[PDB]
Amino acid sequence: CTVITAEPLDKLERVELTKKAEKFVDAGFKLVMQEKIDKKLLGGFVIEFSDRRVDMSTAKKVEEFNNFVNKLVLSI
Amino acid sequence: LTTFTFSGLQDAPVAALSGSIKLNVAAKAGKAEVTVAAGAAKAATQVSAAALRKLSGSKISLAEVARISVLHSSIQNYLLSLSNERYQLLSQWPDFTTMYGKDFYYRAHPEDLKKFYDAADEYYKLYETVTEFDSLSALASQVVPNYAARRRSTVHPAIGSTVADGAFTNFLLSKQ
Amino acid sequence: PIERQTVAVYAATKGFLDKVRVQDIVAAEEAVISQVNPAVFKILKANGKITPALDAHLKAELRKVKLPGA
Amino acid sequence: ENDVPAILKEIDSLVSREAVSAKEVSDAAVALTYLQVKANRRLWGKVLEKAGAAQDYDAASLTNLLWAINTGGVEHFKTVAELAGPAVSLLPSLSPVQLSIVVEALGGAGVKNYELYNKASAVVVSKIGEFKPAEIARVLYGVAFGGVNDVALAKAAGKVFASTEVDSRTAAQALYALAKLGRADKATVDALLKSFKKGTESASDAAAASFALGSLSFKAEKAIVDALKASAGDLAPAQAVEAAYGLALSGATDAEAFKALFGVVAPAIEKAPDALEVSSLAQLHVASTISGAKLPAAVGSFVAKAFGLAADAARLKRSSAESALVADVAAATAVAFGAQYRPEVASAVASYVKTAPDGSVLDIAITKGDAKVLVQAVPSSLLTSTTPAKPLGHVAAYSKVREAQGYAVAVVPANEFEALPDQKAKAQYVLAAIKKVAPSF
Amino acid sequence: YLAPLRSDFTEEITAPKVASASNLVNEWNN
Amino acid sequence: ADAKALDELRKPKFSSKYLIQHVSQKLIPAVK
Amino acid sequence: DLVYRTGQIVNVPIGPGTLGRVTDGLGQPIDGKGPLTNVRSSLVEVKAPGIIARQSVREPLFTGVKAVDALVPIGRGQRELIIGDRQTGKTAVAIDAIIHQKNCNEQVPKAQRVYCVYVAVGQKRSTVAQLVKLFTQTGA
Amino acid sequence: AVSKKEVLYFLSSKDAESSTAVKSYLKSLYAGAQVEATETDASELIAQLEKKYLSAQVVEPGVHNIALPLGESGSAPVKRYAAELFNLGAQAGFECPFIEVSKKFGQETATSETVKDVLNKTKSYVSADYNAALNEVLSSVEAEINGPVLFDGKTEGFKKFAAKAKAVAVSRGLPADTILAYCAGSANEDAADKVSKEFFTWFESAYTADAAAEVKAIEAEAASILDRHLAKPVAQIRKEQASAYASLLKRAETAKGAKWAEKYLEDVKAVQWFDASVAEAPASGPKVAA
Ligand SMILES: Nc1ncnc2c1ncn2[C@@H]1O[C@H](COP(=O)(O)OP(=O)(O)OP(=O)(O)O)[C@@H](O)[C@H]1O
Ligand SMILES: [Mg+2]
Incomplete structure (x- = not known):
């Protein structure tokens, strides 16, 4: 695995996003999370499985928020 | 205005400045003897020093009563004051109906006479269209939406390039 | 449109454009559309068909046209 | 011989002609001020139109016009600002x-x-x-x-x-x-x-000194308070509510002064409940709460609703560095009550934002059973502009109204909070400010 | 006299794009 | 009909204010 | 390089907001008039309507070309091949069928109006700029 | 009806239709009605979207209520116009323009490592005549260092840029040092007061110049529209304006059930009332029940 977040993790965030990330392995697989730092993310995490990527970051949440808002106000 | 005003009967006007309305007051120790007249009328009332302090208790709070908007009436007023500057140079047009007689018809070249009659027709077109003043109120509605969308800004209604530039120096030349 | 097309092929197949020279049949048929009455095009647009009360009126109107060459 | 609407119609015809200079405008405004003409707004509007239209100006005409604009209590921002x-x-x-x-x-x-x-x-x-x-x-x-x-x-x-x-x-x-x-x-x-x-001599001035000494939170001076209780018909309801507010904020308990002041402002609200600003109704609730003087039945619940309205509206239009300060102080309350991780402080500051009884929203509202400790951040807008830098009177006002609803407001100002090194110092500072008002937590 | 209603926001902070002075005074003087 | 008000006549007329309100009324329950 | 899958089969924006506009091979407008307002995406590879989804071609499609409208007439729902050699009048037959629908749309009721789509594949970009200029100054 | 986020933004509003809705809500509250709860919900993106679409409903009747100072002499009508826009922004929930656009800069550049992405991501809020002049100076110091100029402040690879960017800022026409000294402050109030009184002269120069540029562009647009309009004959003018008015009426009459459509046709009827009321007494104006 590769979990790359904004700031370095403390103990409860690790146990939380490990429980969040084990809902993405398609068995009883034993995730071997790697930790990296990227402050271009503003919180959240992005998981790099080298086969798939689930981007739970808040920078992408802001980007999809703004894309949905600019999508919806032009239909109204 | 504020809720508390501190003006009245202390360094007030003791005389009027025009010729059209006559004011004289006798500021005594407590009160004032105000007696005013404007042409055909007389008015002599009594105010105290605490009678003008009660005057600013409820505010008048004037407001424009506009046909469409105060903004739209300002744009229409500018269009009217521009139509005035075009109409002033249609007021300086030389009188061509002094040359409508048959003395000037038959001395003149036929093409120059047809040009002179076209010039008179053109002045009538320009003068019929500069005095269509019912069209200015719909001309002002084409300046209104683009201006109102420029004021409907995500930053501030009153933002411009110079304030944003000064804030960019303050944001940039301070640390990070 | 469709009605000025079918009046022109009418005037070409009902013999009205015989003895007109071949060089200005392309030039005669503007007269066959302009000089023929503009309200006979409305009936053939509204009916969609040459009625018996219209061929006898249209071929009366294809005779009051001034064709070139002739 | 004494006909004042006759002179009102003649100065109406003085400012309705097309080439009125500034001096006729000035003298018409001054004549309208001395005649106390507050019922007729159209004549004042004509004077203000011709005041904005006039171009030549000398000293005395401009000052007589501006004096008349003050003393008449007329306001039109475009004309005065131009x-x-x-x-x-x-x-x-x-x-x-x-x-x-x-x-x-x-x-x-x-x-x-x-x-x-x-x-x-x-x-x-x-x-x-x-x-x-x-x-x-x-x-x-x-x-x-x-x-x-x-x-x-x-x-x-x-x-x-x-x-x-x-x-x-x-x-x-x-x-x-x-x-x-x-x-x-x-x-x-x-x-x-x-x-x-x-x-x-003017109870507008005693009311203004009352409001100023209340917002600066100095004293109840007793030469101002009895002057307010003796001349409480001199004041408009919006002036008298600021009088009562600045008396309550500055430590006055004179129940008859507040009775005579509320005798001005209650029949205005039964006269028209929309006549006052919602700021003034919040100030009425503050003055009726701190001094504890009674209002009528329909008025007390009304200003109780409008206090929550005005405080919640000031929460929506928060200064966005006060929002950052409330975020930092709420994180300090999270670390202070024991939270060493970021999801812990996140779910704590998501939990401190319980609502108020009157419909408002309190940003930091801590509940342990029945005792409630509120934390109040005071950024710089409610701080004094001087080097001691104490909070203004409105801080103690909001503290005293929240304390009459079951809270022990722990005021955390920002002149001391953002001087602190890091989050441990801020957490123990906020816990000290909480224990100083209620040590049960 | 009336205008179409618009609901959009100006995201930029730009120069207000001063338009070109038309030739009507010089053309009418001609 | 005649002599409407002052507070009714102070309204600017063809401002948006309700197309903005229509967008914010159709938008916020859809984006929550 | 990294390739991400979008999850979606190839689709284009359809609707009445495409009317008037010049798009590229997938939807995106190339005329410099901003985004396509009032439009909706749908797939480009749709199964054609089967037997029970049709009826017989009976309404006429007027092209305005009398060599076509007399001798080889065209109904609505009919596909007609314009085949020819290099510089014959192939586009000119098809441009005349589009311009003629503008002349008929002003005269028919709103239900029987024909909305035209010209797909320009492999042409010059200035060849299709000459057609947008022709469809503008005719009004088609 | 208002939704209580509607009415908290309209308490400090002073336009007409906001104030009558506030007064009707308070007269509802006095007659035995409770306030509803305030939503302590709608996390930060929805809260920002709501305050964005609620500031516009305070700004939009306020922009239409501000007379433009078109064709005026002196800078005092321009200062009236800019102060009215300042007051409208303060009533709608904005801060000072300086604070607000600085907040926009700091919001758009929380991810910024280099000065290149600073000068490329705040391009929509800085003028092109200043962004290009800072881009060429960033390139001039980048040619010196041959390493990317980073957004650090303490790194003097940044400071070699910033000492020339201050020269660009003083060559634009704006005093950068009094701005930096204002937003840096001081300890003693007597020595910070003398630089706040210089910053405010710059600030008044800047917002008066921005309002004056907007007013001159509106004057140029009005004069261009008029000189294109005075070239037509009158029947063309009448049929163009009547056709546009008829289309804009039918676009609001095909809208049935929308609030803006009923408000549109009610304002059309109020304009027709204004015309009838000045036709009844043209020397007195419209009839105002005072
Ligand atoms: N009905 C017509 N009458 C006169 N000239 C025509 C007619 N149709 C086409 N032309 C001329 O023939 C030339 C070729 O027409 P067109 O562009 O349709 O060719 P094409 O068959 O589309 O070939 P290509 O696709 O290679 O351009 C055009 O320049 C046009 O001027
Ligand atoms: Mg071709």
Whole structure:
């Protein structure tokens, strides 16, 4: 695995996003999370499985928020 | 205005400045003897020093009563004051109906006479269209939406390039 | 449109454009559309068909046209 | 021989003609002021139209017009704010008293003209002994209410107010101006409170000193309080509510003063419940809560609703560095009650935002059973502008109204909070401020 | 006299694009 | 009909204010 | 390089907001008039309507070309091949069928109006700029 | 009806239709009605979207209520116009323009490592005549260092840029040092007051110049529209304006059930009332029940 977040993790965030990330392995697989730092993310995490990527970051949440808002106000 | 005003009967006007309305007051120790007249009328009332302090208790709070908007009436007023500057140079047009007689018809070249009659027709077109003043109120509605969308800004209604530039120096030349 | 097309092929197949020279049949048929009455095009647009009360009126109107060459 | 609507129609026809100069406008406005014409607004509107239209201006016509605009209580921001052209073009040509009336009128309306207040402050500090102290209070009122935080004019005024004996109305104006600036310099305020020894001739001025000493949170002076209880028919309801508010904030408990003040403002609300601003109804709830004087049945619940309305509206229009400060102080309450991780402090500050009883929203509301400790952040907008930098009177106002609903408000100001090193110091500071008001937590 | 209603926001902070002075005074003088 | 008000006549007329309100009324329950 | 799958089969914006506009091979407008307002995405590879989804071609499609409208007439729902050699009048037959629908749309009721789509594949970009100029100054 | 986020933004509003809705809500509250709860919900993106679409409903009747100072003499009507826009922004929930656009800069550049992405991501809020002049100076110091100029402040690879960017800022026409000294502050109030009184002269120069540029562009647009309009004959003018008015009426009459459509046709009827009321007494104006 590769979990790359904004700031370095403390103990409860690790146990939380490990429980969040084990809902993405398609068995009883034993995730071997790697930790990296990227402050271009503003919180959240992005998981790099080298086969798939689930981007739970808040920078992408802001980007999809703004894309949905600019999508919806032009239909109204 | 504020809720508390501190003006009245202390360094007030003791005389009027025009010729059209006559004011004289006798500021005594407590009160004032105000007696005013404007042409055909007389008015002599009594105010105290605490009678003008009660005057600013409820505010008048004037407001424009506009046909469409105060903004739209300002744009229409500018269009009217521009139509005035075009109409002033249609007021300086030389009188061509002094040359409508048959003395000037038959001395003149036929093409120059047809040009002179076209010039008179053109002045009538320009003068019929500069005095269509019912069209200015719909001309002002084409300046209104683009201006109102420029004021409907995500930053501030009153933002411009110079304030944003000064804030960019303050944001940039301070640390990070 | 469709009605000025079918009046022109009418005037070409009902013999009205015989003895007109071949060089200005392309030039005669503007007269066959302009000089023929503009309200006979409305009936053939509204009916969609040459009625018996219209061929006898249209071929009366294809005779009051001034064709070139002739 | 004495027909005042006849002279009203003749000055209506004076300002309805097409080439009226500024002097006829000035004299018509002055005649409308001296005649107390508040029922007819259209005539005042004609005078203001011709005041904005007129172009030539000398000193005396401009100052008579501006004096009439103040004293009549008429407001039209476009006309008054466009009179800053004749003001700033004639500023050396104005007399000391004329400059005082000009800057007082252009400040009291709210004209944002920094050239005018800078070129007026330079005149007041250039010729300071040349000015009567009432003119000093007038320019202080103008530069304070014009949005200029002028320290130089305030100190040069305070030296004069220490040097010269001033009038009661002059003192009330300087108190109102210093409270709008938010100064609370004691060496000026106690020098200005020796001028309320004659009695106050206008209860507008005693009400304004009441409000200024309440917002600066100084004292209940008893030469102002009995003057307010003796002349509480002199005041409009919006003036009397600021009187009662500034009496409650400054530590007065005179129940008959608040009774005579609420006798002004209650039949206005039964006369029209929309007649006052929601700011003034919140100030009425503050004054009815701190001094504890009673309101009628339909009025007390009404101002109880409107206090929550005004405080919640000030929460929605938060200064966005007060939002950052409330976020930092709420994280300090999270670390203070024990949370060493980021999801812990996140779910704590998501939990401290319980609602108020009146419909409002409290940002940091901590509940342990029945005892409730609220934390209140005070950024800089509610801080005093001076070096001691204590919170203003509205801080203790909101604290005392929240304390009458079951809270123990722990005021955490930002002049001390953002001086602190890091989150451990901030957490123990907030816990100290919580234990100082209720050690149960 | 009336205008179409618009609901959009100006995201930029730009120069207000001063338009070109038309030739009508010089053309009418001609 | 005649002599409406002052507070009814102070309204600017063809401002948006309700197309903005229509967008914010159709938008916020859709984006929550 | 990294390739991400979008999850979606190839689709284009359809609707009445495409009327008037010049798009590229997938939807995106190339005329410089901003985004396509009032439009909706749908797949480009749709199964054609089967037997029960049709009816017989009976309404006429007028091209305005009398060599076509007399001798080889065209109904609505009919596909007609314009085949020819290099510079014959192939586009000119098809441009005349589009311009003629503008002349008929002003005269028919709103239900029987024909909305035209010209797909320009492999042409010059200035060849299709000459057609947008022709469809503008005719009004088609 | 208002939704209580509607009415908290309209308490400090002073336009007409906001104030009558506030007064009707308070007269509902006085007659035995409770306030509803305030939503302590709608996390930060929805809260920002709501305050964005609620500031516009305070700004939009306020922009239409501000008379433009078109064709005026002196800078005092321009200062009236700019102070009215300032007051409208303060009533709608904005801060000072300086604070607000600085907040926009700091919001758009929380991810910024280099000065290149600073000068490329705040391009929509800085003028092109200043962004290009800072881009060429960033390139001039980048040619010196041959390493990317980073957004650090303490790194003097940034400071070699910033000492020339201050020269660009003073060559634009704006005093950068009094701005930096204002937003840096001081300890003693007497020495920070003398630099706040210089910052406010710059600030008044800047917002008066921005309002004056907007007013001159509106004057140029009005004069261009008029000179294009005075070239037509009158029947063309009448049929163009009547056709546009008829289309804009039918676009609001095909809207049935929308609130803006009923408000549109009610304002059309109020304009027709204004015309009838000045036709009844043209020397007195419209009839105002005072
Ligand atoms: N009906 C017509 N009458 C006169 N000239 C025509 C007619 N149709 C086409 N032309 C001329 O023939 C030339 C070729 O027409 P067109 O562009 O349709 O060719 P094409 O068959 O589309 O070939 P290509 O696709 O290679 O351009 C055009 O320049 C046009 O001027
Ligand atoms: Mg071709």
